[PDB]
Amino acid sequence: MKRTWQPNRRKRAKTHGFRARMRTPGGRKVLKRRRQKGRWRLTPAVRKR
Amino acid sequence: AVKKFKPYTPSRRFMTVADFSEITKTEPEKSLVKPLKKTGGRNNQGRITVRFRGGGHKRLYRIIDFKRWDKVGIPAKVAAIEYDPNRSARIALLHYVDGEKRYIIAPDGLQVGQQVVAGPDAPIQVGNALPLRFIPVGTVVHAVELEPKKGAKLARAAGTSAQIQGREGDYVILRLPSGELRKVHGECYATVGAVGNADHKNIVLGKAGRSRWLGRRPHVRGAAMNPVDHPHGGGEGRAPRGRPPASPWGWQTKGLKTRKRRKPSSRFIIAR
RNA sequence: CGAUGUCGGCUCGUCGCAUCCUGGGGCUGAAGAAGGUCCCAAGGGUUGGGCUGUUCGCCCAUUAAAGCGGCACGCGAGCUG
RNA sequence: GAAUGCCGGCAUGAGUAACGAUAAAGAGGGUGAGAAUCCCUCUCGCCGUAAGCCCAAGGGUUCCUACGCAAUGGUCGUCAGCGUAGGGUUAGGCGGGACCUAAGGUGAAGCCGAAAGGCGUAGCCGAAGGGCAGCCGGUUAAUAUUCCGGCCCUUCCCGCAGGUGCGAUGGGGGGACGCUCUAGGCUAGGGGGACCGGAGCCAUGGACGAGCCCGGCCAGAAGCGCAGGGUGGGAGGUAGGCAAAUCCGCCUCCCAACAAGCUCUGCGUGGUGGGGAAGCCCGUACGGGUGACAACCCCCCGAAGCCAGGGAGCCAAGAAAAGCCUCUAAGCACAACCUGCGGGAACCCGUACCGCAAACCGACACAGGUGGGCGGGUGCAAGAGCACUCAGGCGCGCGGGAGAACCCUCGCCAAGGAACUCUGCAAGUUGGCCCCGUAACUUCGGGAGAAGGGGUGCUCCCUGGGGUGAUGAGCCCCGGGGAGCCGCAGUGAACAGGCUCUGGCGACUGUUUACCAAAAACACAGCUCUCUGCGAACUCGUAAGAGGAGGUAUAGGGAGCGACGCUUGCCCGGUGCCGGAAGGUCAAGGGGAGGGGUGCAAGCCCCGAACCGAAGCCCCGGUGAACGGCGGCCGUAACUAUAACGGUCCUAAGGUAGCGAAAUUCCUUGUCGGGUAAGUUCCGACCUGCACGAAAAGCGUAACGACCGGAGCGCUGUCUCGGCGAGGGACCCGGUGAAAUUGAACUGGCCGUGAAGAUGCGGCCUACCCGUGGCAGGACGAAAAGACCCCGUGGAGCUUUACUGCAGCC
RNA sequence: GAGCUAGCCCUGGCCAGGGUGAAGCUGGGGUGAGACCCAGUGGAGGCCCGAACCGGUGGGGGAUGCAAACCCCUCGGAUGA
RNA sequence: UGGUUCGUGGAGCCAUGGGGGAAUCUGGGCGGACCACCGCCUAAGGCUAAGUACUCCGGGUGACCGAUAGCGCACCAGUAC
RNA sequence: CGCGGGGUGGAGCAGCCUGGUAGCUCGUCGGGCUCAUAACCCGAAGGUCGUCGGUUCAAAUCCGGCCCCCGCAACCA
RNA sequence: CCGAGGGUAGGGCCCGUGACUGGGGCGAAGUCGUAACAAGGUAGCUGUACCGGAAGGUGCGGCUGGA
RNA sequence: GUGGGAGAGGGUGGUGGAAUUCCCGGAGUAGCGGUGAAAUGCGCAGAUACCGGGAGGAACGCCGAUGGCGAAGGCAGCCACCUGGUCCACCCGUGACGCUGAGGCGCGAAAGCGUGGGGAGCAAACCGGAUUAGAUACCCGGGUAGUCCACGCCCUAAACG
Ligand SMILES: NC[C@@H]1O[C@H](O[C@H]2[C@@H](O)[C@H](O[C@@H]3[C@@H](O)[C@H](N)C[C@H](N)[C@H]3O[C@H]3O[C@H](CO)[C@@H](O)[C@H](O)[C@H]3N)O[C@@H]2CO)[C@H](N)[C@@H](O)[C@@H]1O
Ligand SMILES: [Mg+2]
Ligand SMILES: [Mg+2]
Ligand SMILES: [Mg+2]
Ligand SMILES: [Mg+2]
Ligand SMILES: [Mg+2]
Ligand SMILES: [Mg+2]
Ligand SMILES: [Mg+2]
Ligand SMILES: [Mg+2]
Ligand SMILES: [Mg+2]
Ligand SMILES: [Mg+2]
Ligand SMILES: [Mg+2]
Ligand SMILES: [Mg+2]
Ligand SMILES: [Mg+2]
Ligand SMILES: [Mg+2]
Ligand SMILES: [Mg+2]
Ligand SMILES: [Mg+2]
Ligand SMILES: [Mg+2]
Ligand SMILES: [Mg+2]
Ligand SMILES: [Mg+2]
Ligand SMILES: [Mg+2]
Ligand SMILES: [Mg+2]
Ligand SMILES: [Mg+2]
Ligand SMILES: [Mg+2]
Ligand SMILES: [Mg+2]
Ligand SMILES: [Mg+2]
Ligand SMILES: [Mg+2]
Ligand SMILES: [Mg+2]
Ligand SMILES: [Mg+2]
Ligand SMILES: [Mg+2]
Ligand SMILES: [Mg+2]
Ligand SMILES: [Mg+2]
Ligand SMILES: [Mg+2]
Ligand SMILES: [Mg+2]
Ligand SMILES: [Mg+2]
Ligand SMILES: [Mg+2]
Ligand SMILES: [Mg+2]
Ligand SMILES: [Mg+2]
Ligand SMILES: [Mg+2]
Ligand SMILES: [Mg+2]
Ligand SMILES: [Mg+2]
Ligand SMILES: [Mg+2]
Ligand SMILES: [Mg+2]
Ligand SMILES: [Mg+2]
Ligand SMILES: [Mg+2]
Ligand SMILES: [Mg+2]
Ligand SMILES: [Mg+2]
Ligand SMILES: [Mg+2]
Ligand SMILES: [Mg+2]
Ligand SMILES: [Mg+2]
Ligand SMILES: [Mg+2]
Ligand SMILES: [Mg+2]
Ligand SMILES: [Mg+2]
Ligand SMILES: [Mg+2]
Ligand SMILES: [Mg+2]
Ligand SMILES: [Mg+2]
Ligand SMILES: [Mg+2]
Ligand SMILES: [Mg+2]
Ligand SMILES: [Mg+2]
Ligand SMILES: [Mg+2]
Ligand SMILES: [Mg+2]
Ligand SMILES: [Mg+2]
Ligand SMILES: [Mg+2]
Ligand SMILES: [Mg+2]
Ligand SMILES: [Mg+2]
Ligand SMILES: [Mg+2]
Ligand SMILES: [Mg+2]
Ligand SMILES: [Mg+2]
Ligand SMILES: [Mg+2]
Ligand SMILES: [Mg+2]
Ligand SMILES: [Mg+2]
Ligand SMILES: [Mg+2]
Ligand SMILES: [Mg+2]
Ligand SMILES: [Mg+2]
Ligand SMILES: [Mg+2]
Ligand SMILES: [Mg+2]
Ligand SMILES: [Mg+2]
Ligand SMILES: [Mg+2]
Ligand SMILES: [Mg+2]
Ligand SMILES: [Mg+2]
Ligand SMILES: [Mg+2]
Ligand SMILES: [Mg+2]
Ligand SMILES: [Mg+2]
Ligand SMILES: [Mg+2]
Ligand SMILES: [Mg+2]
Ligand SMILES: [Mg+2]
Ligand SMILES: [Mg+2]
Ligand SMILES: [Mg+2]
Ligand SMILES: [Mg+2]
Ligand SMILES: [Mg+2]
Ligand SMILES: [Mg+2]
Ligand SMILES: [Mg+2]
Ligand SMILES: [Mg+2]
Ligand SMILES: [Mg+2]
Ligand SMILES: [Mg+2]
Ligand SMILES: [Mg+2]
Ligand SMILES: [Mg+2]
Ligand SMILES: [Mg+2]
Ligand SMILES: [Mg+2]
Ligand SMILES: [Mg+2]
Ligand SMILES: [Mg+2]
Ligand SMILES: [Mg+2]
Ligand SMILES: [Mg+2]
Ligand SMILES: [Mg+2]
Ligand SMILES: [Mg+2]
Ligand SMILES: [Mg+2]
Ligand SMILES: [Mg+2]
Ligand SMILES: [Mg+2]
Ligand SMILES: [Mg+2]
Ligand SMILES: [Mg+2]
Ligand SMILES: [Mg+2]
Ligand SMILES: [Mg+2]
Ligand SMILES: [Mg+2]
Ligand SMILES: [Mg+2]
Ligand SMILES: [Mg+2]
Ligand SMILES: [Mg+2]
Ligand SMILES: [Mg+2]
Ligand SMILES: [Mg+2]
Ligand SMILES: [Mg+2]
Ligand SMILES: [Mg+2]
Ligand SMILES: [Mg+2]
Ligand SMILES: [Mg+2]
Ligand SMILES: [Mg+2]
Ligand SMILES: [Mg+2]
Ligand SMILES: [Mg+2]
Ligand SMILES: [Mg+2]
């Protein structure tokens, strides 16, 4: 059947990107938490040009 | 007149379509004056706030003239009468000698080629606009302003009118389509005649689809729902209500008057 | 009750006898034929259909007869639903 | 030592089930330490509106080459999408960006919000939408519309030359638009050819023949030709297009009414460039050479594509902005702008490969899911259907034998034809097309493919219409009539309704529980009620604001009923709602009669009765397509029976019409009648309606239904009652090799007994040790800390005249 | 968190081939004019058969599956809500 | 209304959203309703070290662990997945 | 089986809970009106209060046991 | 070839019969009520509509077969 | 044909006053309505009666007749438009052109049906209050369809002279 993962580079970027997270206090805290944690990747790596 | 069909299909046996014979050879509209992009959307910034809206034909807005006092004294020739997707009535395309082209909402009896004009001057004829004062008591009228210089707001639906009843210092009394008795300021413009397309009420949609074409989504009964959804939801195999009938939001829907009492508008109203 | 799947049907049977039939027998208000009733006896047999989920039952057409009951109202790691 | 304990390790089931579509394989020869599995050739099979080819998304090195085989591959592996290394992705014209706007997003001004933040015209961002200049070949092992060859374009910038008032983010024009049906002329693509080109080929009885086989094109500027799209020309007057216009618009006169003229596309033609089979020889993993100076021509079919803003019709009335044309303003007119020709300038990102899939989403090389374009031939009425088959791609990454039961899938059957069973569930008959021919009923359309029939192949003869061609041949479509031929059978294979009668429910097409319900449930046009006068009602939000609506009573919200037909009776006592400037009660407040605490007092500070005081309630009226409700007990007719009639009690009023043992009837298989040999069902009646009933509508209704019930016809393996056959497993061998489960086990029956159902206790009976294929009675067999039930002062969802608050409104 | 799912908004795309034959238009007829009736043309429809496609009706298989919803035969819609 | 031990209590004091609304030392607040007396302070402007909290970071010590312990990580761990 | 409501002149109903008096309508009877009957008018008659028990000074009335009558209930399995 | 006739399939008409139901006719002395004929005690009759155990009533308009 | 005449003959538009009912304002009290008699009903929440204003609908007093017009059904305030029939004078024209009329077609009171509108008075049904033995009637108080309009059906009558 159709499963739940339907990859889209634009969606992933607009949805979970560094700039989206930065836009709101909710998201800014996510970066803070991930930084303090020592996460190698703050936001998902969306590729291609 | 109303177009009628034979039952060559079920739902074609009741279905019924407007007569478009008053639609003069001018079916597609007029750029310049209108159209605008019209912005379909069944809801506010976010959430739906009027249920069951959506779908249905794309539209172009015809930006019509609801304040006729710009062109006081300037007459215009009625050039055409065309279909307007965004109202019950039809619209008149008129050419002002000025050059300017406006649409007026098209009254019953309006003929193409006719002369029409607005102002204190203005022969009392179908199509003309006047401040309510100079209009003879008892004449039927439409596109009436509520307060002066604020635009036509009463009687624009197809086949509607108001009748002038009497006067009272600065106000003339109106009898509105609903039957209400209203004091409306003398200085309010209103155009003589009834609205026309009066056979609009006689049309039978005929099937579900037609409803959808006009963007009317299926309306579901409270009875059909559940207690979470509606006062009428549940219980077992059908149910008669079990309380005084209500809206989904709990207010009673048979009888409960809802106009606020202390409206300052009150001292200008005399009926139902 | 940290689970003994619960009606009926089907499938496969098997057992008890307080025996429906067949074998044996006494009494009979047993002429004979056919019955009645009790005793011995389970080796074998104990049909097909209509209605009903039905068990049962009521019919239909037959029959030597169309037996009662037990096996977790036998049998769902065998089927059905 | 126990916690269905936690982490780890190793057992058991077990050499067991399985090894992922039943599209299928065989052989010869290579390589190699080692071949069913790798390369090659020959034969065979499968796809072919794909299982072929091309884009997009996603993926990200998987592409190409060399060397490798521990692991990954469900077996093997010399192989690989695997490991090591090296290479490979070339653009002014393709896509995206230094262009534009959509929904939405962001957002200066502005508004709002305890903070965070929320709105928000202009603007900005935002694209498979608009705008926009490259086509055809050749090369690499791996890229090419990117490199190269030919031919052809676009922007800039700077020059010369010739024109004109030039000139804006500003005005106007355009861009610019629906759905169905569509004409004319074209291309794509396809079929035919006695014509042209071509290696070859006569087989096995015959054929050296207009014999077979293969192939007969592609691109292409200017100029032409054929189609076709767009479009009037003057002159006046001018107050509108938010300054200004000569522009547009509006009025008025003249000339056109035409595509005549101007453009602008498409298609043919074109200087030129290029391609070019079968077969044979070769050595590749594959391509190369020859065939060749290849030929490259005539017919016919023909689009859904092109001309495109074509045309007609209809109602539900069908984006925006820039580029582009023009108009003028500030300014500038030694500028500038248009046209022609030269020269120079032309950046950024993508480009590999996969792509209906072993490279994407499903933990897997997973029988699943995944958007757009091409998708040849023949036959079957047509077609993207179905059978075969081009091109091209595959044989699905375990095999080999065997020929048990049993299962899956499939084929056939004597005689009977539903006796099967909950039910004709399943399976069968039926089936395409042409022509006969069709009932009740009906909303006049339908019911209709009703039903029921007949025709269907091939051969020869006569003969009628068109289409393309000149009015003709051919070629291509449709027809008619006449003889005859063969077979069990002519839509000879594949695709292709079983039919009728009668009830229930719903009018109808639609929708729904994604993953057990597709329905009689939801929806539906339509009907009635009720709110709403516009800063509407209502809804979301603390607000600002937004929806409603750029609407305005023929409109918008809420509620029910649910096409249509005939209709929807009585009760307003209670509850609801609606209406009542009386009254009663009613809070803060007002008012202070009156009294209190301190003070030597002036004073300060306390309570506090009258009385004036809202809505709400009470009270008075209305209202049922508002919530709801719509009786009992006796008696009576000149045979009995029964009760039109009467008495009485109570109610707010005592169910009318119509229906009724019903999706409603407990007693119940009610009682009659019909179908049947037989009928708890079914149909028609009666009414004794436990417990129908009129918009939670009542009684009907043509038509419709993967709904539900009953009957018959037809037909059958459903059954009597099975039998045989096929293939995929099951079984034996070689290779890889799990699982839940498991206190340990050296794990028999009977009658007992034991917490009451014993392999384990007693007595007795039976019984040599170990397996393999099978069957499921048992191990209260596995699986889930029972769903039902109860319990816990456990939890949630829901309700209301439970309590208490809150939003909201008064 | 709406890359599954529900609804809506903006912008694109798809729907072979067959049947049935509404209005209207045209001629003829009828009348005083009409209505109306005959053809012929016309090509409408939440119309019909049927692919793609969108579904998921009945039965079987599958049940440590190919698959945490699948496969086989069958079946509903397929110009529209 | 909040704060205080103070939950309306005889309910003060300190803050305040709403209404009314003074005075400048013979002026004002307070000592738990209030009043008298006796006393204590001088509101409606601001600043102000140190003593006090914490431990990312360095150092020291341990009747603290010793690779299922000790930080999740003694090991290229907030990694693989 | 459980529950709660009911038996009163000839008919239908009141009278009970706050024990002492049994009342209403109809019917029946006698008379009057009418030629006659009904209607109407004047008079009258009429009740072991389902049975059994005792509580009281006293039971239709209060409390128990039976008896018919009516209505409700019988649910999860 | 046609063809009596048989077979199958579906229609049309007529007659017979059917639980039950509809109204009707007729039958000396059963029930209820009083509609009509006299101004029949509400003039009557009428087409229509609604309601009612029944004759019948009432609404609307009409007629003289009444003042 | 020329020339005139009477008319409630027909359709469409427009308009006038009297009266009824509801609303508002003034003034005003203790009852008003109603019948055979009453009661229901209305009224100190200010009725009835009177005055002033407003709205709305239907029907047209006097003229009016025992009259006129029409083929009937039927037609009645006034105005205008459009239109049918008809009668007289003159005897000018045509010149037998006539009468009736199965069927067809049209018209056809009232009540009734559909869609929409309108709704003041009246009023089936319906609810009350009296009357009666009972009253589903007659009388009284209310009251919905309908009565009115547009369009479309219905085709009946003591459509009677
Ligand atoms: N009579 C002809 C028609 O039928 C009916 O008439 C029938 C009945 O109504 C009528 O019944 C009458 C009754 O009306 C009258 N008031 C009392 C009488 N005793 C009855 O009598 C009837 O029944 C008895 C048996 O009991 C028979 O013997 C007698 O012949 C018969 N007429 O008897 C008639 C039978 O012939 C209609 N009512 C009448 O108006 C109508 O025109
Ligand atoms: Mg919002
Ligand atoms: Mg937002
Ligand atoms: Mg309507
Ligand atoms: Mg609904
Ligand atoms: Mg529900
Ligand atoms: Mg709720
Ligand atoms: Mg129910
Ligand atoms: Mg109820
Ligand atoms: Mg409810
Ligand atoms: Mg248990
Ligand atoms: Mg256990
Ligand atoms: Mg178990
Ligand atoms: Mg014995
Ligand atoms: Mg004997
Ligand atoms: Mg059965
Ligand atoms: Mg037995
Ligand atoms: Mg038992
Ligand atoms: Mg049993
Ligand atoms: Mg059992
Ligand atoms: Mg078992
Ligand atoms: Mg079941
Ligand atoms: Mg222990
Ligand atoms: Mg373990
Ligand atoms: Mg085993
Ligand atoms: Mg095995
Ligand atoms: Mg195996
Ligand atoms: Mg495989
Ligand atoms: Mg095959
Ligand atoms: Mg070798
Ligand atoms: Mg094949
Ligand atoms: Mg790699
Ligand atoms: Mg490779
Ligand atoms: Mg190699
Ligand atoms: Mg291997
Ligand atoms: Mg090797
Ligand atoms: Mg590699
Ligand atoms: Mg640049
Ligand atoms: Mg940009
Ligand atoms: Mg924002
Ligand atoms: Mg915006
Ligand atoms: Mg932009
Ligand atoms: Mg584009
Ligand atoms: Mg481009
Ligand atoms: Mg490649
Ligand atoms: Mg090049
Ligand atoms: Mg210029
Ligand atoms: Mg512009
Ligand atoms: Mg070509
Ligand atoms: Mg030979
Ligand atoms: Mg060819
Ligand atoms: Mg200007
Ligand atoms: Mg070649
Ligand atoms: Mg066009
Ligand atoms: Mg712009
Ligand atoms: Mg590339
Ligand atoms: Mg590529
Ligand atoms: Mg594809
Ligand atoms: Mg692949
Ligand atoms: Mg594989
Ligand atoms: Mg796959
Ligand atoms: Mg995969
Ligand atoms: Mg797909
Ligand atoms: Mg094709
Ligand atoms: Mg093909
Ligand atoms: Mg073909
Ligand atoms: Mg075909
Ligand atoms: Mg195919
Ligand atoms: Mg057989
Ligand atoms: Mg046979
Ligand atoms: Mg048969
Ligand atoms: Mg049977
Ligand atoms: Mg049986
Ligand atoms: Mg059946
Ligand atoms: Mg079947
Ligand atoms: Mg039928
Ligand atoms: Mg034959
Ligand atoms: Mg349905
Ligand atoms: Mg489901
Ligand atoms: Mg299902
Ligand atoms: Mg269905
Ligand atoms: Mg309806
Ligand atoms: Mg708004
Ligand atoms: Mg709006
Ligand atoms: Mg319903
Ligand atoms: Mg009702
Ligand atoms: Mg009530
Ligand atoms: Mg009430
Ligand atoms: Mg009331
Ligand atoms: Mg009130
Ligand atoms: Mg007070
Ligand atoms: Mg009050
Ligand atoms: Mg009734
Ligand atoms: Mg019955
Ligand atoms: Mg029977
Ligand atoms: Mg049968
Ligand atoms: Mg029978
Ligand atoms: Mg029945
Ligand atoms: Mg019901
Ligand atoms: Mg109802
Ligand atoms: Mg219904
Ligand atoms: Mg029914
Ligand atoms: Mg039906
Ligand atoms: Mg359906
Ligand atoms: Mg269905
Ligand atoms: Mg079989
Ligand atoms: Mg077999
Ligand atoms: Mg086999
Ligand atoms: Mg093996
Ligand atoms: Mg266990
Ligand atoms: Mg042993
Ligand atoms: Mg035992
Ligand atoms: Mg032992
Ligand atoms: Mg033992
Ligand atoms: Mg074994
Ligand atoms: Mg077993
Ligand atoms: Mg087994
Ligand atoms: Mg078991
Ligand atoms: Mg438990
Ligand atoms: Mg408790
Ligand atoms: Mg979505
Ligand atoms: Mg089609
Ligand atoms: Mg036609
Ligand atoms: Mg069609
Ligand atoms: Mg369709
Ligand atoms: Mg396609």
Ligand SMILES: [Mg+2]
């Ligand atoms: Mg679905």
Ligand SMILES: [Mg+2]
């Ligand atoms: Mg299925």
Ligand SMILES: [Mg+2]
């Ligand atoms: Mg199974």
Ligand SMILES: [Mg+2]
């Ligand atoms: Mg299908």
Ligand SMILES: [Mg+2]
């Ligand atoms: Mg269909």
Ligand SMILES: [Mg+2]
């Ligand atoms: Mg279909």
Ligand SMILES: [Mg+2]
């Ligand atoms: Mg506090």
Ligand SMILES: [Mg+2]
């Ligand atoms: Mg304050």
Ligand SMILES: [Mg+2]
């Ligand atoms: Mg203070």
Ligand SMILES: [Mg+2]
């Ligand atoms: Mg103080």
Ligand SMILES: [Mg+2]
């Ligand atoms: Mg102090």
Ligand SMILES: [Mg+2]
């Ligand atoms: Mg103190």
Ligand SMILES: [Mg+2]
């Ligand atoms: Mg102090």
Ligand SMILES: [Mg+2]
């Ligand atoms: Mg240690």
Ligand SMILES: [Mg+2]
């Ligand atoms: Mg550790």
Ligand SMILES: [Mg+2]
């Ligand atoms: Mg260690």
